[PDB]
Design a protein around this ligand. Structure first.
Ligand SMILES: Nc1ncnc2c1ncn2[C@@H]1O[C@H](COP(=O)(O)OP(=O)(O)OP(=O)(O)O)[C@@H](O)[C@H]1O
Ligand SMILES: O=C([O-])C(=O)[O-]
Ligand SMILES: [Mg+2]
Length: 532
């Protein structure tokens, strides 16, 4: 277990874990590679070697998060501050848990990990020492340890020297809860959090995303309370120091579009915004691999090598991967340490204040324009709305473009965001990476061209006009982009086709925003939304 930094069995005994004979502290990438490739492994622990040099694993019955199994202990520390599922007006997954049931779940996990060979990985959540969390991850599955090593900030030998955990996550994926029915829970699985004890317990599900998004939820709780923005976005910097953030729901393009060879990548999913600027919470990127194209996305493709971890992909007998196959799941992914991307911010993932705020959305209705410059009020309206539809039309409204990870009320996030934007004189833009009248998704080539026009200032100097109903300012023409697609009405046989669909989508926005009108501030924002 590494050098002068290891843990004693007496220390694990304090967490409630007993009889641990073999401890693997701070595992190296080489050891992880050996553990995963052990030919005697059976089941979901087993990994396979691909022709690209990266190991591939299957995450079990769960290939994505399970929000129905997410619980937060309601006590005197979280009672008056948490955005509870049974008290507010907005729908959320922050279901309350009694301290007594928590104790029951903690016993299940500690017993499951007792008498086992354990992996212990210490890491940081947050690039800044003043607001970061020192997290200790405990697991009995090698690839899960690999996932946290990739996704979180890897400490230096000196940092490990005086490492003191302020948050502990015990992954007991192999165990389940037989008393769930009598405890009023959703199922035998569970993803629980206790802010008094500062711990996260996982049971039944092997999916690594629970640990990643679980800690994101905790940052989303602590930071805003300190006046710091906690955002679900990707980010990069230009040579001039111009920072751009990209908000959006899953599959909208945060990871694909931020990985721009012309710009230095800061992060791809979770960032904070304080008095000094934007900073990454993580130490790696988590890319989607369905229908992955080497030609269209070379940087992400080249990141798939030894130390990267493929998930639920289909591998053929000859070691080759079939990226197009989504039989196991459409949520095929690969995690990798951030340095697998050549052009990144080093040695610390952070930069100055963002001046360009981009909201990405995949509109399956084919109504919204490819690009539009938003007003201050429209920015707040769309942020709270958090729109997207379908994949590859069913609407989805997720506040702040990430409601599933919010620990506080949505307006609290909007407040701090506006605060930071006004101070930096930031400008907002709405980008539709989705569909139009053709019934096909806009090309990644055209989308990248649009992003370039935003960053280089072409869009800010372009001649614009107003799109009816949504009242969005759209450019008459844009360098490197096809003029015909800029106006969504042009993609249909007749502008009346767009009209019918536009009215349908407009009504969906109006109905959804109705829950924010219970305050004078939210009532004033309705004027910023679409109007028949
Ligand atoms: N025009 C387009 N713009 C962006 N992505 C596109 C476009 N056309 C197809 N895609 C595909 O859509 C997906 C976008 O995924 P990406 O990983 O960027 O989503 P994300 O917003 O980062 O999701 P998550 O929040 O789950 O991490 C990729 O598979 C990408 O190849
Ligand atoms: O599971 C998720 O949504 C993730 O981590 O991207
Ligand atoms: Mg992503």
């Amino acid at each position: 277990m590494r050098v002068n930094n290891g843990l004693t069995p007496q220390e694990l005994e304090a967490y409630g874990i007993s009889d641990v004979h073999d401890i693997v502290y701070n595992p190296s990438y080489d050891l992880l590679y050996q553990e995963e490739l052990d030919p005697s492994l059976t089941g979901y622990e087993r990994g396979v070697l691909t022709n690209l040099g990266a190991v591939a694993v299957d995450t079990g019955i769960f290939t994505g998060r399970s929000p129905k199994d997410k619980y937060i202990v309601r006590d005197d520390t979280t009672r008056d501050t948490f955005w509870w599922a049974d008290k507010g007006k907005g729908k959320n997954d922050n279901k309350p848990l009694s301290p007594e049931t928590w104790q029951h779940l903690k016993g299940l996990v500690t017993r499951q990990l007792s008498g086992k060979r354990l992996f212990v990985v210490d890491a940081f959540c947050g690039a800044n020492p003043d607001t970061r969390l020192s997290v200790r991850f405990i697991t009995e599955v090698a690839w899960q340890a690999h996932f946290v090593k990739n996704m979180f900030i890897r400490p230096s030998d000196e940092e490990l020297a005086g490492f003191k955990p302020d948050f502990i996550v015990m992954n007991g994926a192999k165990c389940t809860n037989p008393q769930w029915k009598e405890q009023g829970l959703n199922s035998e699985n569970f993803v629980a959090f206790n802010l008094t004890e500062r711990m996260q317990l996982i049971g039944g599900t092997w999916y690594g995303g629970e640990m990643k998004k679980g800690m994101f939820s905790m940052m989303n709780y602590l930071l805003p309370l300190k006046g710091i923005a906690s955002m679900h976005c990707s980010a990069n910097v230009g040579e001039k120091g111009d920072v751009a953030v990209f908000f959006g729901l899953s599959g909208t393009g945060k990871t694909t579009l931020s990985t721009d060879p012309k710009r230095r990548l800061i992060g791809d999913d979770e960032h904070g915004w304080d008095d000094d600027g934007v900073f990454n919470f993580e130490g790696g990127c988590y890319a989607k691999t369905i229908k992955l194209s080497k030609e269209a996305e070379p940087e992400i493709y080249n990141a798939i090598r030894r130390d990267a971890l493929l998930e639920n992909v289909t591998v053929r007998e000859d070691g080759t991967i079939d990226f197009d196959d989504g039989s196991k799941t459409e949520n095929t992914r690969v995690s990798y340490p951030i340095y697998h991307i050549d052009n990144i911010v080093k040695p610390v993932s952070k930069a100055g204040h963002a001046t360009k705020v981009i909201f990405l959305t995949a509109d399956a209705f084919g109504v919204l324009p490819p690009v539009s410059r938003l007003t201050a009020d429209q920015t707040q309206y769309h942020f709270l709305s958090g729109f997207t539809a379908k994949l590859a039309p069913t609407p989805t409204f997720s506040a702040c473009f990430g409601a599933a990870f919010l620990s506080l009320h949505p307006t609290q996030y909007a407040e701090v965001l506006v605060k930071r934007m006004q101070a930096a004189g930031a400008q907002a833009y709405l980008v539709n990476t989705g569909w139009n009248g053709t019934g096909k998704r806009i090309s990644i080539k055209d989308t990248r061209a649009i992003i370039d026009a935003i960053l280089n200032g072409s869009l800010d100097n372009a001649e614009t006009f107003t799109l009816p109903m949504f009242n969005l300012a759209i450019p008459t023409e844009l360098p490197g982009v096809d003029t015909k697609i800029l106006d969504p009405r042009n993609t249909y046989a007749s502008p009346e086709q767009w009209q019918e669909k536009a009215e349908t989508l407009a009504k969906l926005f109006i109905d959804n925003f109705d829950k924010y009108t219970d305050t004078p501030a939210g009532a004033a924002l309705v004027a910023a939304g679409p109007k028949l």
